[PDB]
């Protein structure tokens with residue numbers, strides 16, 4: 001039993017809710033919140049900008065030190081950093097950004113990072129300002145992630161479309 005509330009169950013291990021991932025993280029304080037990161041960990045907008053703002057920019061400060069030491073992530077890769085006031089840990093995962101021309105096949109590799117964590121609160125990777133089709137992202141999630149994932153979808157209209165079209 002866990003503390004996630006109001007989710008629709010899609011499969012054995014994937015759950016979905018119309019929710020603001022920031023508000024959801026603040027209430028649940030999950031072990032892992034996933035950030036929709038880029039390779040530079042520049043958290044300017046979308047989910048990343050929102051999560052970083054909620055940390056009062058502490059996420060960005062920590063991220064800048066990470067990059068200065070380690071260099072950029074790979075598209076499809078991830079790193080574990082602090083969850084600050086939102087979660088124990090933040091798993092920064094880089095899905096391909098279609099608005100930069102990155103290969104959508106890398107979306108499966110991106111979701112594979114979730115399998116290193118037993119339970120996660122997450123957005124749909126490569127959705128929103130990353131330019132992928134969220135219906136496709138949900139399909140890849142379901143077909144790739146085997147651990148327990150609680151998906152937060154900010155837009156109610158999109159949430160309803162994702163549920164109604166789910167196979």
Ligand SMILES: O=C(N[C@H]1c2ccccc2C[C@H]1C(=O)O)c1ccc(NC(=O)C2CC2)cc1
Nearest residue numbers: 022036046047050123127128129152153154155
């Ligand atoms: O952009 C956002 N979500 C979309 C996005 C973008 C980029 C990558 C993946 C995704 C998934 C997509 C979604 O709706 O699930 C987003 C989510 C939450 C906030 N919360 C706040 O601003 C708090 C109220 C002050 C802001 C933006």
